[PDB]
Every structure is written in C-alpha cells, then in structure tokens.
C-alpha cells in the first residue's frame, strides 16, 4: 500500500508549493516568496509561516498539519526546498549545491495552561507560555548514518533517523554474521546542532500556596542559543512522550520572546555642550540624587568617585591606580542606602550589597552596613593559602562604603565624612518631605529633567563616554603648589598616600570638563574637598 | 538616473482605450493629436493619458497583446532556454507595474499574469548577478556585452561601474611598476 | 589673478590623510644635516646604527628627499603577510591592518622603484591579486539589509556605498505597488 | 638624454614581444584609412624567398653580413621572423620558462612513453649542440630553464657563458655542483668567553643576480645542466618536460618555426595622425630580428618624411638582464627611433 | 520641423546628459522653443471661459511633464559647471579653436565667469592674501574623468569600429566591432564622439 502513501505525500508537496508561491497581500506582494529569496541570499536556510494565513489559503492542510505534524511537516520542508531552487537558479559558479531549509511556525491563539494539557493532545501541536530556567550546552545529533557489517563488510547507506529525543534500532541480522553485527562509521554520517532547555510555568498562573511545575524542551538548528535563563517566552511545539509509563517533553517549532560604547554626532554635540558650560561640575553634583536634601560636598565627592583619575604604567612596570574610595560615618539614618542605590543605578557597572568584592572589573561597588580586604583595596587583588589551595583573584574597581559607627583600614579610603541639631531646619525639611510623600500618594491615587537637573539616561552615557576618552595630566604650575602645601603641613599624619589621593581628585575634577590638563583651579578645589572631608576625622573621635 | 525617471520615460508609450465620454474636435497636444473620442469605439493614446482617464472613470483600458498568458509562457520558455538575456517588449516591467497599480480591474487572468511576470524577473535577475560576478574575477579585459538588457535593469546595477573604475587604477599601477 | 594647475585630487580630505601617514626609513650618516630631525620631525637626536640613522618619516616629506635614503616595509606589507594575503584574502579584515591599504601600497611602490625594482613589482602584483579576490564579495554583500561594511578599506567603501544606494532605490520603487 | 648612431646597436637580451608604430601605411594596407584590423597578406614566392635568404645568411654557423638581398621586401619581413627550437609539443607554449612569467597555460596530460622518449632524445640533442659549440665552429645558442636563462657565446678565440636571474640558493647549488664564476670574528670570541667562564654555549641575499663563466670552467656548467633535478621540473604544468633550446642555424631534432604576425589601423580626432601598427608575438625575439626589421623599413622608404619618425619597441628583456654587460660591443635598449640617416635611443 | 520632433530630440538629450560624466555640447535652443510653447498654451487656456472639463486637465498635465524635463536638464548642467568652473571655460575655448560646436551657451558662459570670480574672492580673503609672494597663485585641479565606465546601446546602423585600452599590455589598444543592436559595458572616452554624434544612447 506504499504507492497510496506516495500519492498522499506528493499531493501534500504540490499544495504546499502552491501556498508558498501564490499567497499575497495584494499587488505584487508575495511575502513568503520574497522572504525566502532574501533569506537564501543572506545565507540563512530557514523560513517562517503563519498558520492563520495558511488557514485562510486552505483549511484542510492546516488542520492536517496540526493533528499529524510528524507525518505532514516534512512535506512542507521539502516544498520549501523545491521553491528555493526555482527562485534562485541559475546560481553562480561555486554555488551549485542546493541547501536544506528549516520551516518554523507562528500561531495567534490563547496559550494553554501548563497544568491543563490534556492526554488527548499527545503528538499534536500546542502553544505554551513560560519562563526559561536552565539551558544546557549545545550538542550534535546524527541525521543520516552509514552502516557496515562486522564480518562480511556489506553496507547500508543513508539510514535516516527521526527527529526529537528518539533512538533507533539497528538491523538484527545481515541483509546480504552473528547477532547484532552492524557498526556505524564515524566519518560518513551527517550531524546537526541540538539543545535541551527547561521551562517553568509563570508565577502569575500558579494557584495559591503551591510550587510551580516544569517541562523539558528540545530545540534544533537555528532555534539553538536563542534564549538565556530568566527569559519570558511563548512556544509553539509538538507534545511528545519520551522513549506503560513515559515522561513528556516538547519538541519546539517556534519561539517568541516577550521582552552603549557607540554614539551619534548629536550625542557628541550634547556631551560637548555640557562640557562647554561653566557650571558643569556644580550641575552634575546638583544632579546627583535630587530627592535627598543638602549634602553638597558629599555629592561632589560621589561625582569624583564616578569619574576617577587617570591610570598609569611607567617603563619599569610599576602601575599607579586611578580609582577613588569614599567612606561615610555617623547615624544609621539620613537616606544613606538610597544614595548607594542611586550610585548603583547611575554607574556604568556596579553592585550594591551589605566573593562580592571580585565582581566589578572597571565598575563601582556600594557596601552598606560596613561595620560587619586591605590587600583588595590597595593591591586590587586578594590572595589565599589554606590547606590544598593557593590562588589570587584580581579585579579593578572603586568602592563607596557606608558605616554606622578599624583605625587600620581608614588609611585605604581617600575621603571620609561624618554625617552628624536639625530640628528648626528639619521643620522645613519635614514640610517638604511630607509634601513629597502626599504627592506620591496622589500619584498612587532628553538632557534635562523638568526641574533643570540632568537625566539618568544621559548622565550614564556621558560618564561612559568620558572614561574612554579624556585621560588628563597636571600642569607644572599646578604641581608647584602641592610641594609647598605638603612641606608646610608636615613641618609647621601627612603621607604620600594623601598626596597621591589629592592628585587623583584633581585629575578627576579636570576629567568632567573634558580638559587636556588640570590646573591650579582644580588643585584648589581638590584641596578644599580633602580638608573638608578628612579633618572631620581629625577633630572627632 | 533612477526608477522614477525610468517610469517617467515608460509613460510615453502608446496604448489603446475605449472611451465612455465623447468629444467632437481632436486634442492638439505638443506631442501630437490624439482625438476625437467616440463612446464604445477604441483608439490609441499615451499611457499617462490612459491612466489619467481611468482614474476619472472616463474610459476602459485594453491590455497589451503580450499580457496574454500564452505569450507570457512563450517569453518564459525563451528566457529559460537561452544562455543570455532574451528579448522583451519595450518598458516591460515598468508598464506591467503601472497597469497592475492603476488598472487591475481591466486585466484578464490577473494572478496568473502577475506570477508569470515575477518568474521572468527572478531568473533575469539571477542571470545578471552571475554575469557581474564572473566579470569581476577578470583582469585581462575591461569590456563585456549585455544584449537585451532593460533600462531599469541597467539602472539597478551601477555598482559594477564603480568597481571597474577602482580596479583600473591598481592595474595601471602594476604597469607603471614593471621595470625596464 | 593668476592660475596654477594642480592635481585632480588636490582638495580630497582622504588623499590628504593618506599623504599624512608615515613609514620606517633610514638615512646615511653625515650625508644630511642633523638639524633635519629637529627641524622637520621634532626629534632631538637621531637613532643611529652601522647602517644609518633610523627614523619614521611622512610620505609628503619623503617625496621631497632627492638625497639618498632607504625604506623598510611596514608590518602589513611584509613578505610573509604578502604570501598570506596572496594565498587567501577573501574574508580578512583589511581595515584592522590599514584604513588606506591600497593607497599606501601604491605610494610605497612609487617610492621603492628606485631602490628595489623587483620588490616594487612583487608588491604591485600582490595588490592586484588581493583586490581581484574581494570585489565580487563586496558587490554581493551590499545587497543585504543587515550589512554594515565593518571590514572594508576606504577604497572598497565607495563600491559598498554605491551598491547599497542602488538597492534602497529599487526596493522603494517596488514597494509602491501593493 | 638621447643617444644615437648610424645603425642599430646590438642588444643580446631575448624578449617576448615586438611592436612597431608608424605614421605611414604598410604595403598590404594601402586601400584603407578607417579604424580596423588588417591581415598581413603574403603574395607569390615571398615566403620561400625569405626562407632562402635566412638560411644563406646563417649557413656557416655564424652570420655572413655580405649576402645579397631578396627582391621583394616582404621576403625581408619573413626572413626576420624565423628560428629553430626543441622540444616539440603542439598546443603547449614553450617560452617564457621562468615560473613567475607564465600566465596559467592549460594542463596537458601525456603518456610516460612520450615523456621518456622525449628525455632520451633531449640528452643527445643537447650534447650535439654543445660539442659543435665548444670544439666545432657554431656561433652561439640559448637555453631557457624553469629558473634561469643561459647564453653560450664566443668573444670576438675565447669562450664565454652567461647565466641570468639567479637566486642565492641557485648560486650555492651551483657551488655544490662545482661551478666557479666571476661574481659581480667577534662571535667566536663571545663563545670562547662564555666557555672560559663556564657559561653554556647553547645560551647573503643580494636580490636577483647574473653570473659569468670563462674558459675551461664552462664544462662543469654543461654537466650541471645535464644532471640536476633543479632544472628538470618534477611537479607542475611542465612535469618531466626538459628545458627549451633555441638556435639560428639547424641542429638535429630542431624544428623550424615562425612568429605570429598581425597589424592594425587607428584613426583619431580628424587629425592627420592615422597610426599603423605591426605586431610579432608568440616566441623569442632573437637579436637578429630587429636588425633585419630595420632593413625592411629602410628598404620600403617609410623614412622619406624623416620629420615623421617610425618607432620600435621590444618587451620583457629584464628577465634576461646581464647578457649585454660583458662587452663594449653590446647595449641595453628598450625603445628605438628609426630614420634613414640614424637610429636613436634613450640613455637608459 | 515640428514641436513633436523637438520634444522627442530633447528627451534623448536629457537622458544622455544625466548619464554622461562630463559636459556635452549645449542644446539650449530646444529648451527655448519648449518654454515658448508652454507660454503659448498657458495664454490660450487663459482665454477660455469654462475650465471644469477634460481637455484643460489633459493640456495642463502635458505642460507639467515638459516643465519637468527642461528644469531637470538645466539643473544637471549647472551642477556640473559648479564643480570646476575654470576647466569648463578652458574646454569651451579649446573647442572654439578646434572649430567644433559650442560647449556653453552665452548665458552659461556668463554664469561660469561670475561664479568663478565669486569663488575666488573667498579664498583670497581667507588664505591667499596672507601667503608669501610666491604662493599667491590660485590652484585649479586637472580633469578627473579618465577611468569612468558606462553602459551604452548602439542605435545607428553603420557605427563601425571602436578602440579601447588593452589591460594585458597597456602600451597598446584593442579594436571592437559594434553591431547595430548591441549593449556594452565600456569606457566613456571610447564612445564620447559617438555620443556627441547621437549614434549611441547611454543607459
Ligand atoms: Zn554480514
């Protein structure tokens, strides 16, 4: 009865060829024909088809494709191959080989709940939604294999293997020789990529007081390496049972996703306009955390932390650091954690936390509750030698620390503040802050913001621009002041660490203006900031 | 030179229409007389004038003889068999696109006509691509023959001219570098 | 009001930038005033060996040196690289090597003609072979919508831009007829 | 600057192509003045008479400068274009043989019987030519190998051989073969110092060149060319095909051959300057060719308006650079102007 | 000669002028005739009392087409003159010395001279007055159309033969035959004279 199946198969190929050629949106717009031609010349051997367009063209083959996908879908792939040959011939010399094309599907329906796939839906096309929770490494699967007999060396070529997580059984005895005599040649088989994923149902759809359920997914060729854990997806695929009890899995036919370092001349002109302004440094310091009152010198210090100094390597190989580090002390209140969260949002790379020290090469780490590493701060490296291990972890970053209160580690911080009788001024602040929170309750009921402060999306891009492009130095006249200041303070706790910290702060201030050189102006502002911050620790405690 | 100017030149061709209005005198265009019009009696006018009347419901357009399905199949057969480009009617693709755009009510067997025109365009495009790729491997000559190319096909393929101009400089540099 | 006829590419910014590049060269000791290295190149003292003063100089200056001098080929045009590029250049990133590849090669041939005719002819043959291996790929690559031309030379960029312009025009004309 | 003489100076470098340009039409062209291609058409006994004049010029084994001329100047044109060559294959180009100068000529598969019998004939043919050159009375001959060109000649006797376009590797290989030629330390102290302290001791290019051999030392070069696999290509389009030999006087297994000739008319811009072009291609352009072609022009009186000169050009002579340096009787030239009163060239 | 012939000649002139890389001999005579025809038809329509009828719309659309052709031709020639004005004057004087047809009309020549003076003033005020006395001459680039290719179609019956450079040996040249329906990819300087004579249409 094989000729009847051959007649059915060739009829299906004829109808799918007619669908790919004749479907149109009016005029000369044959969308699938044009898409197939563009994909083939782009060297992407794939096509994507909408089943509602197919249902409007012919209802019967669409219904058959849904109910018998393992029988009907290879005919559609074969029809796509034939139409691609017709479209592209005569191909140029060297490109005579005809490639093999993968067909994918889309479908406009409500997805089925992952808990409510009926047992009648085995071996049928279904649509499911969820979250990707895990993703394995890509592996190879054999499509066609060559067999040879162990004793008499007779061969069976081009034995084809069915798709999915299915095995296949070898011939038990020789066709032309003991039990199970055939072997598989490693050199004369064809292979394609595949990948396994795991899908979790959406937490919105879990019934109250229960854990979510899971399903395993199988993907092939162009559908591999398309997703990462955490992604939200909708999937069209065949519901299958893995080879009287079996576990189920889904063979994927279509995925739908439910979700810097480059600039325009407009962006460069915007950055340069802000750099050309005289009040740019004060404007950036004002733009840091506008919801939190006051703290002007602290906001200036955080701007210096974000921009940093230059980084140097002399001919003998000893490097000089560019990072800057800041510490905050005093009462546990006054929105310290909100300042740290703002720096975490604004910084090009960064982390907030209460190891963690490693994870920010070129970035910023905010540490709360610091009263809970000396090598990490100075050497930008930590080391270990315990039983059976010795390694070193190296990473470059700047650190902002908040404490609630060792005298040893105070040497490692460039700037220190003590936050500390507010009640009369705090009455006006209470009026403003409670008016803000009642306005937030009422709410519950692109360089500039509306209030003149800089936007976060512009500020983050501008910091990322400046760090990769400015790189300043000091003028000799700027260098001449620091020598006299150092000698006077030391011969009226003065150290070379403090001198290099002042030099780094002066370079950081000159970076924001996009200067070639730092001058006496930047040195004097750096000295003012250093005195105002550090002498609080000399006066207190 | 671009596709809009190609369509502009293609508008000067003549085509036959059947008016429903009537008029007594001729119309003395600078491009020559076209009238008079009698209702139900066909006559020949320019393509731009035909489309202008068809938009105002003043006539019915009669398609060219080469838009018959048998004639299109003959053209496709010759284009498939010949190694070079086969010969076509003047402004073939432009007149096809203009009439499908503005007068598809009057074309007969519209989908079959449209599909055959798309087939002819596809394989002529492949022939031109292969010829240009095989030319750009050359170093021995700066000449090729491209008989029966259409104006819009020539307009779409101007990268080859720039590539040949760039190749000639390096060839001249090698000739001047040859010692004596 | 008097007129001076000049080169056809006198005002070309790309040609000025191409002339502004520099190559490694060597000059004979004592045959030139050592004021030259401070006067033209801004170098206080030449680096010196048994063969001569060793420096880098720009092409605009090197054309004016009617005295004796010698040229060393840069890294991108060294003979091992010539063998590599002549073997297969169909997918290599020439812009990573040099943004003015063919232009600097033609300048090097014109300079090296008096010192080393065989090396000059060998480099010219290499340039012709390298461009022949890549022009068809450029003209084909221009037809994709997602192409952005990252790897191409300044000379190849002209062909790429013209091809993409033609593709945009014909696609815009076709999509009226829906 | 310009250099000049009464007659054409000799250049001994063999070239690949000759082109001659004139403002006066050639005899077979005179019907036409429109732009187009013209056949070089010969008439009656002209080719046979030119062949007679050629063999009579070279009958003694060296040139006789006193033979009477033919009557048709077309026979002078024919006699200028002839030479003898071995080996023989129809449909394969046999010059130039340096691998850098081949365009990609097509593959030709051949039987081992054909290649073996060809090599067996080649050894006898080459030995016969060399015997008649050294101890007989032959003038000169050329050999074009895959790596170099060689010339054997006599000084106006003393014998001289010249080799051209060699590498340092080929020079050292000939040294290992035992040829001699008149071609154009502190590290030991450092190693000694290291060994004296007890530190462990484990702590020429010159481009392309020519060579000249005098006298009795030529016989070593003869045996080297007989032997080496360096000159007998074992891999490529010229697999197992022996080197080419060329002469201007007959030798055993030598085949008589002729250059390809063609001609064109160009017209431009409504000017007086129609231009008439003659080409000779597809073989070596030996030094006698230019000398006879000068006589073809001067016999047919194309110089009569000497205010409109005629120019001649010979190409690819740099592959054989050096063959005219060993004497004051020769010259390097590439482009030449002919008049009746003089012949001129550049200082070069 | 009819206006129906003048318009047909003008269209072929417009196509050749767009395709050619340099300046063809001027054809402002046909432009002046067609502009006068536009004005005559405009005044004739202005004498009509009834305008909401088919004839007036057909006439006005034809005037639209003719105005487009003439305007685009003049714009292309002005954009060519602006690239190098001194060289255009030089080529016109050389054609006059050779006794050939005009490259520029009188108004085009006047425009070229006035634009050249206006362009000279900016360079003299910005740079050249500050130079040393040897460096005060005005630079003028040479022509640049040496290696340009065209697609060309043959229309005349008896065109004959053409010569092109030989890329195998650039000392010499190769001869081609042009059969009277063919299309070629060819250098422009080989077909320049035939494009002037109207035996070749550029594409
Ligand atoms: Zn068996």
Curated annotation (Swiss-Prot), chain A:
Its main location: nucleus. SMART domains: MCM. GO terms for cellular component: cytosol; MCM complex; nucleus. SUPFAM superfamilies: Nucleic acid-binding proteins, P-loop containing nucleoside triphosphate hydrolases. Residues 280-434 form the MCM domain. It catalyses: ATP + H2O = ADP + phosphate + H(+). Its EC number is 3.6.4.12. GO terms for biological process: DNA replication initiation; double-strand break repair via break-induced replication; premeiotic DNA replication. It holds the Pfam family MCM_OB. ADP binds at residue 320. It comes from the Eukaryota. A motif (Arginine finger) lies at residues 411-414. Component of the mcm2-7 complex. The complex forms a toroidal hexameric ring with the proposed subunit order mcm2-mcm6-mcm4-mcm7-mcm3-mcm5 (By simililarity). Acts as a component of the MCM2-7 complex (MCM complex) which is the replicative helicase essential for 'once per cell cycle' DNA replication initiation and elongation in eukaryotic cells. Core component of CDC45-MCM-GINS (CMG) helicase, the molecular machine that unwinds template DNA during replication, and around which the replisome is built. Belongs to the MCM family. This is DNA replication licensing factor mcm-5.
UniProtKB/Swiss-Prot annotation, chain B:
It comes from Caenorhabditis elegans. The keyword ATP-binding does not apply. One of its GO terms (biological process) is DNA replication. It comes from the Eukaryota. Required for correct functioning of the GINS complex, a complex that plays an essential role in the initiation of DNA replication, and progression of DNA replication forks. GINS complex is a core component of CDC45-MCM-GINS (CMG) helicase, the molecular machine that unwinds template DNA during replication, and around which the replisome is built. InterPro entries: GINS_A, GINS_bundle-like_dom_sf, GINS_Psf2, PSF2_N. Component of the GINS complex which is a heterotetramer of gins1, gins2, gins3 and gins4. GO terms for cellular component: GINS complex. It is found in: Nucleus. Pfam families: PSF2_N, Sld5. Its main location: nucleus. SUPFAM superfamilies: GINS helical bundle-like, PriA/YqbF domain. Coiled coil: none annotated. This is Probable DNA replication complex GINS protein PSF2. Belongs to the GINS2/PSF2 family. Keywords: DNA replication, Nucleus.
């Amino acid at each position: 009865t094989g000729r009847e199946l051959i007649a059915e198969y060739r009829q299906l190929i004829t109808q799918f060829r007619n669908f790919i050629r004749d479907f149109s949106t009016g005029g000369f717009g044959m969308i699938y024909r044009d898409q197939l031609k563009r994909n083939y010349f782009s060297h992407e051997y794939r096509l994507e088809i909408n089943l509602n367009h197919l249902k409007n063209f012919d209802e019967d083959i669409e219904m058959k494709l849904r109910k018998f996908p393992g029988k009907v879908l290879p005919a559609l792939e074969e029809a796509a191959k034939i139409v691609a040959d017709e479209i592209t011939t005569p191909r140029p010399k060297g490109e005579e080989k005809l490639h093999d094309i993968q067909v994918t599907l889309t479908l406009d329906e409500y997805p089925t709940s992952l808990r409510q796939v009926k047992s009648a839906q085995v071996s049928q096309v279904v649509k499911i939604s969820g979250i990707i929770v895990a993703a394995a490494q890509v592996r190879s699967k054999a499509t066609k294999v060559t067999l040879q007999c162990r004793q008499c060396k007779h061969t069976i070529p081009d034995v084809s293997i069915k798709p999915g997580l299915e095995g296949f059984a070898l011939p038990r005895t020789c066709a032309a020789c003991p039990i199970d005599p055939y072997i598989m040649l490693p050199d004369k088989c064809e292979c394609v990529d595949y990948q396994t994923l795991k899908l979790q149902e959406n937490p919105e759809d879990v019934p109250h007081g229960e854990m979510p359920r899971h399903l395993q997914l199988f993907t092939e060729r162009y559908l591999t390496d398309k997703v990462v854990p955490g992604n939200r997806v909708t999937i069209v695929g065949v519901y299958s049972i893995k080879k009287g009890i079996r576990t189920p899995y889904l063979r994927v036919l279509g995925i739908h996703m439910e979700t810097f370092t480059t600039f325009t001349p407009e962006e460069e002109r915007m950055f340069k306009t802000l750099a050309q302004r005289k009040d740019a440094y004060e404007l950036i310091a004002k733009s840091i955390a506008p919801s939190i009152y006051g703290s002007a010198d602290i906001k200036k210090s955080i701007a210096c932390l974000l921009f940093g100094g230059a980084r140097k390597k002399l001919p003998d190989g000893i490097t000089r650091r560019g990072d800057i580090n800041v510490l905050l002390l005093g009462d546990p209140g006054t929105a310290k954690s909100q300042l740290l969260k703002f720096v975490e949002q604004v910084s090009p790379i960064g982390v907030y936390t209460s190891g963690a020290m490693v994870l920010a090469d070129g970035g910023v780490v905010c540490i709360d509750e610091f009263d809970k590493i000396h090598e990490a701060m100075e050497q930008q490296t930590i080391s270990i030698a315990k039983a059976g291990i010795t390694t070193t972890l190296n990473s470059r970053c700047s650190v902002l620390a908040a404490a609630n209160s060792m005298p040893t580690i105070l040497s490692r911080f460039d700037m220190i503040y003590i936050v500390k009788h507010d009640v009369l001024k705090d009455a006006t602040l209470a009026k403003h802050v409670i008016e803000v929170h009642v306005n937030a309750s009422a709410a519950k009921e692109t360089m500039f913001d509306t209030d003149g402060f800089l936007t976060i999306e512009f500020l983050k891009k501008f910091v990322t621009y400046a760090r990769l492009n400015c790189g300043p130095r000091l003028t000799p006249q700027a260098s001449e002041k620091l020598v006299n200041h150092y000698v006077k303070m030391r011969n009226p706790p003065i150290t070379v660490r403090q001198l290099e910290a002042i030099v780094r702060i002066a370079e950081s201030i000159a970076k924001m203006e996009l200067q070639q050189f730092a001058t006496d102006k930047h040195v004097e502002e750096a000295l003012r900031l250093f005195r105002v911050s550090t002498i609080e620790a000399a006066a207190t405690g | 030179m671009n596709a809009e100017r190609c369509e502009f030149i293609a508008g000067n061709s003549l085509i036959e229409v059947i008016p429903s209005i009537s008029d007594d005198r001729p119309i003395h265009l600078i491009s020559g007389d076209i009238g008079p019009f009698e209702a139900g009696v066909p006559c020949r006018i320019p393509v731009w004038t035909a489309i202008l009347m068809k938009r105002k419901h003043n006539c019915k357009v009669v398609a060219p003889q080469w838009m018959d399905v048998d004639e299109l199949k003959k053209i496709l057969t010759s284009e498939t068999e010949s190694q070079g480009l086969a010969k076509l009617p003047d402004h073939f693709f432009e007149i096809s696109h203009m009439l499908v755009r503005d007068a598809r009510e009057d074309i007969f067997e519209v989908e079959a006509v449209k599909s055959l025109v798309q087939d002819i365009y596809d394989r002529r495009d492949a022939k031109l691509r292969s010829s240009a790729i095989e030319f750009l491997r050359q170093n021995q000559t700066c000449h090729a023959q491209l008989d029966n190319v259409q104006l819009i096909e020539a307009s779409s393929a101007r990268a080859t001219l720039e590539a040949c101009r760039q190749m000639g400089a390096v060839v001249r540099n090698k000739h001047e570098s040859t010692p004596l | 009001f008097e007129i001076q006829r000049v080169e056809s590419k006198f005002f070309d910014l790309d040609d000025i930038i191409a002339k502004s590049d520099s190559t490694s060269c060597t000059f004979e000791i004592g045959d030139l005033n050592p004021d030259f290295f401070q006067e033209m190149l801004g170098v206080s003292k030449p680096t010196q060996n048994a063969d001569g003063y060793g420096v880098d100089a720009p092409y605009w200056l090197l054309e004016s040196v009617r005295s004796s001098f010698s040229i060393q080929l840069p890294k991108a045009y060294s003979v091992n690289m010539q063998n590599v590029l002549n073997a297969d250049s169909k997918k290599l990133n020439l812009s990573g090597l040099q943004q003015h590849f063919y232009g600097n090669g033609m300048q090097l041939c014109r300079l090296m003609k008096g010192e080393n005719p065989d090396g000059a002819l060998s480099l010219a043959r290499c340039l012709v072979s390298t461009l022949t291996q890549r022009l068809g790929e450029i003209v084909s690559t221009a037809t994709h919508l997602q192409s952005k031309g990252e790897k191409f030379d300044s000379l190849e960029t002209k062909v790429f831009l013209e091809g993409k312009r033609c593709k945009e025009d014909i696609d815009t004309w076709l999509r009226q007829d829906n | 600057a310009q250099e000049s003489a009464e007659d054409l100076p000799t250049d001994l470098r063999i070239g690949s192509k000759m082109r001659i340009v004139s403002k006066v039409s050639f005899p077979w062209m005179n019907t036409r003045k429109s732009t187009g291609n013209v056949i070089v058409k010969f008439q009656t006994n002209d080719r046979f008479d030119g062949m007679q004049y050629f063999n009579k010029t070279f009958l003694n084994g060296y040139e006789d400068p006193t033979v009477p001329l033919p009557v048709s100047p077309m026979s002078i044109l024919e006699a200028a274009s002839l030479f003898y060559q071995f080996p023989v294959i129809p449909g394969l180009k046999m010059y130039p043989r340096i691998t850098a100068e081949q365009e990609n000529v097509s593959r030709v598969s051949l039987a081992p019987l054909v290649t073996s019998t060809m090599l067996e004939q080649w050894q006898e043919c080459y030995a016969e030519l060399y015997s008649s050159y050294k101890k007989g009375q032959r003038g000169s001959f050329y050999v074009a190998t895959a790596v170099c060109n060689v010339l054997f000649t006599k000084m106006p006797q003393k014998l001289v051989a010249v080799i051209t376009h060699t590498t340092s590797a080929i020079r050292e290989h000939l040294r290992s073969q035992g040829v001699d030629f008149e071609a154009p330390s502190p590290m030991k102290l450092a190693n000694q110092w290291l060994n004296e302290i007890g530190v462990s001791p484990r702590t020429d290019r010159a481009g392309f060149q020519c060579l000249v051999v005098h006298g009795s030392k030529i016989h070593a070069l003869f045996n080297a060319l007989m032997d080496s696999d360096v000159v007998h290509e074992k891999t490529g389009p010229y697999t197992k095909i022996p080197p080419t030999l060329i002469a201007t006087s007959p030798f055993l297994y030598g085949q008589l051959l002729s250059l390809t000739k063609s001609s064109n008319i160009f017209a431009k811009a409504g000017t007086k300057c129609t231009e008439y072009e003659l080409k000779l291609e597809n073989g070596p352009v030996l030094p006698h060719c230019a000398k006879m072609m000068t006589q073809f022009i001067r016999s047919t009186n194309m110089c009569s308006t000497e205010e409109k000169p005629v120019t001649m050009q010979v190409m690819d002579r740099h592959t054989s650079q050096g063959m005219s340096d060993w004497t004051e009787t020769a010259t390097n030239w590439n482009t030449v102007t002919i008049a009746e009163n003089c012949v001129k060239w550049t200082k070069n | 000669t009819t206006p129906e012939e003048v318009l047909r000649k003008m269209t072929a002139t417009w196509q050749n002028e767009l395709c050619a890389p340099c300046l063809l001999p001027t054809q402002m005579e046909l432009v002046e005739i067609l502009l006068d025809q536009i004005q005559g038809m405009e005044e004739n329509i202005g004498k009509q009392t009834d305008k909401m009828q088919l004839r007036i719309s057909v006439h006005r659309v034809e005037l639209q087409r003719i105005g487009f052709i003439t305007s685009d031709y003049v714009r292309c020639r002005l954009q060519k003159i602006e690239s190098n004005p001194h060289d255009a004057i030089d080529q016109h004087k050389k054609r006059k010395e050779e006794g050939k047809s005009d490259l520029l009309s009188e108004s085009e020549m006047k425009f070229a001279e006035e634009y050249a003076l206006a362009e000279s003033n900016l360079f003299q005020k910005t740079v050249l007055e500050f130079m040393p006395a040897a460096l005060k001459k005005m630079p003028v680039p040479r022509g640049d159309h040496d290696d340009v290719m065209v697609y060309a179609k043959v229309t005349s019956d008896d065109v004959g033969n053409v010569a092109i450079p030989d890329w195998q040996d650039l000392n010499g040249e190769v001869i081609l035959e042009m059969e009277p329906e063919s299309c070629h990819l060819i250098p422009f300087e080989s077909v320049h004279q035939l494009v002037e004579d109207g035996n070749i249409q550029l594409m």
